[PDB]
Amino acid sequence: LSKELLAEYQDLTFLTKQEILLAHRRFCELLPQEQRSVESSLRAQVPFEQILSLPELKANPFKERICRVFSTSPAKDSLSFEDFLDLLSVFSDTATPDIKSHYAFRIFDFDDDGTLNREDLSRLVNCLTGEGEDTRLSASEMKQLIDNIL
């Protein structure tokens, strides 16, 4: 489903509390001492440089998409508390795969036109099949199969 499903989650609290505890400390480890107080973390965002610690984003080198797409801020390089938590919630593959699809989709979808564009289409079957590997090789054959399923 579209942001319609997640829209209901964020507007709620599907996010656990324990995970938050870790963020308060575990993360404050990379944040200055004068910021160790979660009090300044609710307004302060996590610098991209430090975010490199979160493997969740490792999915794509230039997470620049996570900042702008996942978060709506001018910096576009500092995960803010706001969504940060909401991310862990929506990132819950509890329900069917549909939820997961939205997770990886929105993240991989930088344009967000309403479907998988050449941009996502690649990064997509790329991670699954494995760009430049055994599966599909260097070529446009990615259209033959993708078109065979559609």
How distant is the alpha carbon of residue 130 from its chain centre? Answer: 19
Is residue 23 within 8 A of residue 84, CB to CB? The reply is yes
Residue choice 45, 109, 136, 142 for contact with Mg ion (CB under 5 A): 109
Token look-up 């430090």 returns: 50
Is residue 93 within 8 A of residue 114, CB to CB? The reply is no
What crossing angle do the helices spanning 3-10 and 81-90 adopt, rounded to 10°?
110
State the nearest-atom distance from the C-beta of 60 to Mg ion, in Å.
Answer: 14
Residue choice 98, 111, 127, 144 for contact with Mg ion (CB under 5 A): 111
State the nearest-atom distance from the C-beta of 7 to Mg ion, in Å.
Answer: 18
Binding mask 54-93 for Mg ion (x = CB under 5 A): ----------------------------------------
**CA–CA gap between residue 38 and residue 32 (Å, rounded):** 11
State the nearest-atom distance from the C-beta of 126 to Mg ion, in Å.
Answer: 14
Q: Between 85 and 106, whose beta carbon lies closer to Mg ion?
A: 106
Residues that bind Mg ion (CB under 5 A): 109, 111, 113, 117, 120
